[PDB]
Amino acid sequence: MQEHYQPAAIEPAAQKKWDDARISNVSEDASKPKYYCLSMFPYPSGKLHMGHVRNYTIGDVLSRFKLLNGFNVMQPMGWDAFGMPAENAAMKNNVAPAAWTYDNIEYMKTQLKSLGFAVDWEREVATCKPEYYRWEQWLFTKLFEKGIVYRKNGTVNWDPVDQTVLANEQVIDGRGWRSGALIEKREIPMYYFKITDYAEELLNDLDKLEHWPEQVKTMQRNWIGKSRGMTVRFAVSDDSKQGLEGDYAKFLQVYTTRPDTLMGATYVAVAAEHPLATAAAADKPELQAFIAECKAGSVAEADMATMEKKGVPTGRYVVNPLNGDKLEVWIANYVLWGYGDGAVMAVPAHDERDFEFAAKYNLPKKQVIAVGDNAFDANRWQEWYGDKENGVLVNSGDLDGLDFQTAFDAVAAKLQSQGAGEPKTQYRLRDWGISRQRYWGCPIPIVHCEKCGNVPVPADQLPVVLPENVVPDGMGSPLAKMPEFYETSCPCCGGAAKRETDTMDTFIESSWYFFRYMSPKFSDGMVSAESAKYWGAVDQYIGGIEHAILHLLYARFFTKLMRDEGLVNVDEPFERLLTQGMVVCETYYRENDKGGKDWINPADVELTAVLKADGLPVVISGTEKMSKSKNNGVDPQELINAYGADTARLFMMFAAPPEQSLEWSDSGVEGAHRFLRRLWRTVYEYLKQGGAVKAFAGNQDGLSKELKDLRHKLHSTTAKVSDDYGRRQQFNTAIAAVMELLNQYDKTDTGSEQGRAVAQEVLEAAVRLLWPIVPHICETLWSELNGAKLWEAGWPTVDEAALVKS
């Protein structure tokens, strides 16, 4: 055993030791209890960043902890390979997205291996390979025939300069983010998953996820947005029926979740596309311009509430069916066509958005709810205005004195008896649009035949292979310009037909990959029945909070779809969920010659803050998440090259709890490396005193008080670390606990015969308690202390007798 700790001399040897023993290569072995620990697989972007290292170190800590406790642990890794980054690098570097992807995969796989993650690489998947996406094409065809996947026209944002479709996030002031050209709204046929058919299942099954953060489940409930409200029909006044057709000439239908406040409606609002808006705008040009501006908007869902609410009056009126009030119809920008009836009522006294809307236009506010003896001021909104449980009705005629649920049922009775309304349940959730006008994605297995219609590709002909010999040029997605791809024969009639050229939303690959890991080479289905029944569901899932809504919902949706097809037998894909925090770092910049800022990487800066190149000052700016935006990313490969994998892993687990943001710190890195030197020196100095002995065990009567105190600290540390790994999942406090054990060990004279035995017991436990976090150095130090295989010695047991004081 060498005196000094040298990671480059031990880390490759420890990795070869694990790989030779195949401790991470697992099968469906019924002799050991399974454990499925999964970290969200990465985009093969080029190289790992610090977020990857934190996520996969966390997953490796939990996996190795369960491994030491005797579980048959599967920790798989793969590549979410489809998407736009490969197309953009293709347009910048004149390479094929496939070639760019596969080279990134090879390099990033080397980095992951150098970090010592206990990963079953024999289960690796690449989602851009036909052997993977053939099965999501298969599920697509099966659901398309059942109507769960359907085709209908939708509206997209067309950029005519870049010749591409853009998301709402890519539109700024009505113009493309890169081209700067005005975007055009176009109706094109697209495919949709009928996810609203599973809305009630996806909402209620969240209650089963006892080991998910309540934050994530709340976000999913709000996204699904179930409401039990009332359909209310307002009869159109006789003086307001010009230009109206059908039922729109008879009544205005609306949906409200507050029918107990129907006596407090002071106006109604309709969407820009509503027929009442169209009829009233046929004359007035200001209404036409307001309708045009609403349609030209491209506001994303995450900013819908922040959008300034505006409206225009129409001069048309409707009648409240409960009190006969004649209310004016307004066109408003917050009423969205396709959501319910595309029309709402407004009770400014008990809905804060209606309050601010009415306060802006001086529209009437009428109180209909009272809570205690609270004072109502029509000029200032108070939180009790919207109270839905402790409120009682006022100014509502025959409904006065009722609470929410009683007034709800009475209003429903009044409306139904006169045919003016009925109860109704609504969901904010929209159907899942999966069509993408992009090349680097999974082809949609549909053939268009003018005789047979939109025909799904048969199962024998799957997959529809995406050609990899493609370099996108920019002037449109190349698939729609490659007759060698889309020209084909109809699988139903053999006649001339055309393949679909749109590709799938890349969220689809990530919606079922956790199942594919169970049998990644199975060629007769998405997942083999024998492996699905063994591994069941993912026991532990680790990823970033940015996937709390869409990805998780999609994955839960796919699981229930695959269960209904009979491929799996679990209702939920992920039992436990851990959301890791961001990795942030200081920023540095120099002022431009044009009044701007040039952002400088931290690796090119030395703190006396001075640029390393010319020794000239640099401005220290705010700390934020690492990104290429302000050029503040710290390359983990340089951290590995300079300190080793164990130092990188230890710093990430010690700097902050997994949920809390991790602040990059040079001294924090150095403190981690110096602790590994201390651990190395501790075992070296111990073995230099007389070599290893048998660790203390059994009756501790007769041990000195100092050695009894060390054993108490030892097994209290084991219980604390076990609770930190297994229950709390706070790895920073576990490292501190082992440090406190080593501190007391340093203060204890362990030179006697019984002292050596206790010292052996301390060090054998300490290297095993830290093995999940820093396995390279712990595997090396364990082999110097004991000749048994560390993974066969197992997780340290707590000696209860060591915790009983006299």
Rule CB under 6 A: which of 491-530 touch ligand QTW?
510
Q: Which is nearer to Zn ion, 147 or 494 (CB)?
A: 494
Q: How far is the CB of 578 from ligand QTW (least distance, A)?
A: 10
- Examine residue 430 and tell whether it contacts ligand QTW (CB under 6 A): no
Residue 626: contacted member of ligand QTW, Zn ion, none (CB under 5 to 8 Å, by partner type): ligand QTW
Partner in contact with 420, chosen from ligand QTW, Zn ion, none, beta carbon below 5 to 8 Å by kind: none
Question: Which stretch, 61-69, 434-442, 623-631, 755-763, contacts ligand QTW (CB under 6 A)?
Answer: 623-631
Q: Which does 493 bind (CB under 5 to 8 A by kind): Zn ion, ligand QTW, none?
A: Zn ion
Residue 625 binds what, of ligand QTW, Zn ion, none (CB under 5 to 8 Å, by partner type)?
A: ligand QTW
The sign of the dihedral angle between the CA atoms of 381, 384, 388, 392 is negative
CA 176 – CA 169 distance, rounded (Å): 10
Assess 583 for contact with ligand QTW (CB under 6 A).
yes
Task: Answer yes or no whether residue 266 interacts with ligand QTW by CB under 6 A.
Answer: no
Alpha carbons 61 and 37: distance in angstroms, whole number: 10
Q: How many CB atoms lie within 10 A of CB 349?
A: 24
Cβ-contact 515, 532 below 8 angstroms? yes
The answer to the question of residue 630 lying near ligand QTW (CB under 6 A) is no
**Tokens 């004149």 sit on residue:** 94
Interaction partner, residue 652 (Zn ion, ligand QTW, none; CB < 5-8 Å by kind): none
Structure tokens at 387: 């109270």
> What's the min distance (Å) between Cβ of 601 and ligand QTW?
10
Q: What does 449 bind: Zn ion, ligand QTW, none (CB cut-off 5 to 8 Å by kind)?
A: Zn ion
For residues 357 and 344, is the Cβ–Cβ distance under 8 A?
A: no
User: Which of residues 10, 14, 37, 50 is near ligand QTW by CB under 6 A?
Assistant: 50
Q: What is the spatial distance between Cα 462 and Cα 265, in angstroms, rounded to a whole number?
A: 57
**83 contacts 666 by C-beta, under 8 angstroms:** no
51 is a site residue for ligand QTW (CB under 6 A):
yes
Whose Cβ is closer to ligand QTW: residue 52's or residue 274's? 52
User: Residue 729 — left, alpha, or beta (φ > 0 → left; ψ -120 to 50 → alpha)?
Assistant: left
Q: Which does 213 bind (CB under 5 to 8 A by kind): Zn ion, ligand QTW, none?
A: none
> Does the protein bind ligand QTW through residue 789 (CB under 6 A)?
no
Nearer to Zn ion, 429 or 452 (CB): 452
DSSP 267-333: EEEE-TTSHHHHHHHTT-HHHHHHHHHHHH----GGGTTTSPP-EEEEEEEEE-TTT--EEEEEEET
Integer angstrom CA distances of residue 653 from 577, 586, 591: 18, 20, 36
The amino acid sitting at 97 is P
Contact partner, 452, from ligand QTW, Zn ion, none, Cβ < 5-8 Å per class: Zn ion
Pick one of 88, 627, 637, 733: the residue that binds ligand QTW (CB under 6 A): 627
The nearer residue to ligand QTW, 41 or 680, going by C-beta atoms, is 41
Q: What are phi and psi of 564, to 5 degrees?
A: -70, -30
Q: What residue is closest to Zn ion based on CB?
A: 490
Which of ligand QTW, Zn ion, none does residue 135 bind to, with CB < 5 to 8 Å depending on kind?
none
Beta-ladder partners of 185: 157
**Interaction residues for ligand QTW, span 64-123 (CB under 6 A):** 80
| Angle at the Cα of 757 from the Cα atoms of 753 and 761, rounded to 5 degrees | 165
Q: Which is nearer to ligand QTW, 514 or 696 (CB)?
A: 514
Cross-strand bridge partners of residue 544: 580
Instruction: Note whether 428 and 257 are within 8 A (CB).
Output: no
Give the count of residues interacting with ligand QTW (CB under 6 A).
23
Shortest distance, position 6 Cβ to ligand QTW, whole Å: 27
User: Cα–Cα distance between 338 and 340 in angstroms, integer?
Assistant: 6
Cβ 588 to ligand QTW shortest distance, Å: 15
Q: Is residue 579 close enough to count as binding ligand QTW by CB under 6 A?
A: no
Tell me whether residue 318 or residue 577 sits nearer to ligand QTW (CB atom). 577
Q: 222 or 660: whose CB is closer to ligand QTW?
A: 660
**Cα distance between residue 272 and residue 333, in whole Å:** 7
Q: How far apart are CA 247 and CA 255, in angstroms?
A: 16
Minimum CB separation of residue 660 from ligand QTW in Å reads 12
576 lies in the site for ligand QTW, by CB under 6 A: no
Minimum CB separation of residue 525 from ligand QTW in Å reads 22
Instruction: Please report how close the Cβ of residue 496 comes to Zn ion at its closest, in angstroms.
Output: 9
Q: Which is nearer to ligand QTW, 55 or 647 (CB)?
A: 55
138: left (phi over 0), alpha (psi -120 to 50) or beta: alpha
3 state DSSP class of 621: strand
Is 408 near ligand QTW (CB under 6 A)? no
> According to the binding rule CB under 6 A, does residue 52 interact with ligand QTW?
yes
- Give, as one character, the DSSP assignment of residue 47: S
Distances (CA, A) of 388 to 70, 176, 319, 453, 547: 52, 43, 25, 51, 32
Query: Using an 8 Å Cβ cutoff, are 164 and 204 in contact?
Result: no
* Contacting residues toward Zn ion, per CB under 5 A: 449, 451-452, 490, 492-493, 495
| Closest to ligand QTW by CB, 60 or 341 | 60
Q: Is the peptide bond before 463 cis (omega within 30 degrees of 0)?
A: yes
628 scored as a contact of ligand QTW (CB under 6 A):
yes
543 binds ligand QTW (CB under 6 A): yes
Q: Which of 70, 544, 657, 794 binds ligand QTW (CB under 6 A)?
A: 544
Q: Report the residue number, 82 or 144, with the smaller CB distance to ligand QTW.
A: 82
Q: How far is the CB of 278 from Zn ion (least distance, A)?
A: 40
User: Binding residue for ligand QTW (CB under 6 A) from 17, 151, 309, 551?
Assistant: 551
| Cβ-contact 7, 646 below 8 angstroms | yes
Q: What letter would DSSP give residue 695?
A: P
Question: Which residue ranges make up the site for ligand QTW (CB under 6 A)?
Answer: 40-43, 49-52, 55, 80, 510, 543-544, 546-547, 551, 582-583, 625-628, 633
